């Protein structure tokens, strides 16, 4: 049975080293058996998991009251946090399945 993937926004986020950067992951769940993961793409071109909801400390996920949206925040961004990020919804039942968001970019700049 088809279901839509989460969306992940904005497409590009630019911040200076030391600031925070927040993406928004949006998921229209059709039931309550799911979990949301936040990933980054490794040099290897492999998803590295950063955090999940429900629940290193620099990567935080927060579920908003609207029952759709999640804030995914890099606290105290560093230059080497620059790269490609995505979120993934995992259906837990009736069939365990992951659907990935589109990928977005973080650029973390040198403080002048």
């Amino acid at each position, epitope marked *: 049975r088809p279901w839509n993937p989460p969306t992940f926004s904005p*497409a590009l986020l*630019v*911040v200076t080293e030391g600031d925070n950067a927040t993406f928004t992951c949006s998921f229209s769940n059709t039931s309550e058996s799911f979990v949301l993961n936040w990933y980054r793409m490794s040099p290897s071109n492999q998803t590295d998991k950063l955090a999940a909801f429900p629940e290193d400390c620099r990567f935080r996920v927060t579920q908003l009251p609207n029952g759709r949206d999640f804030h995914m925040s890099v606290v105290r961004a560093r230059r080497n946090d620059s790269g490609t990020y995505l979120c993934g919804a995992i259906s837990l039942a009736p069939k365990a399945q992951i659907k990935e968001s589109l990928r977005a*970019e973080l650029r973390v700049t*040198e403080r002048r």
Partner: antibody
Amino acid sequence: EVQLLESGGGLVQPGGSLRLSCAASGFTFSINAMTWVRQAPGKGLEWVSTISGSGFSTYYADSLKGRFTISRDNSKNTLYLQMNSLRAEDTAVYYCAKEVYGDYWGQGTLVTVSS
Amino acid sequence: SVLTQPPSASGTPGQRVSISCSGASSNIGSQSVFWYQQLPGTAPKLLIYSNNQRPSGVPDRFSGSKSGTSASLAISGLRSEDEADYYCAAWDDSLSIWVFGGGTKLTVLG
């Protein structure tokens, strides 16, 4: 849903200064990067400045030579552009836009630099 | 502008037109390309994000691609309503700036 409304445009004398405002609604402003872009009559878009949600990261076109300051007040859902030492060449429509890349744009406000 | 586009482009109704955007390794080569449509008398609107994705409201007649330091916007099924100025843009990681291309005026002849 998203709405962006510029104000503060109009006539200013050469060497003068002006502050533009942009009022935002329909999204979570405090975490959202915000941008100014301008466009002189009959010419191309020129990126001016972007500010991070917190205000702690700001970027500027090199051509401005630090005459402009971007700022924001998350309390009021408002973005600002302070423009100083204005020259004829600054005459343009100034657009407020959401994100560094402008997923949504205001309708713009015309700044005319003239005596 | 450091993203160069043809100043003009044209086709006739129903045809396919392509608008190029040329950059460098520090921008198009390593960063996502975005495109904008600016109809006469209006503010720009986002047309393509992340090289090739369409925001909601944008028909599938518009597509984007990128290879190396060049990118392209294609418009299939050209219509009168497509007459507009089109811009590409991208981040430049060598100067830490956002750059708009110089813009392309699209006319629909015939």
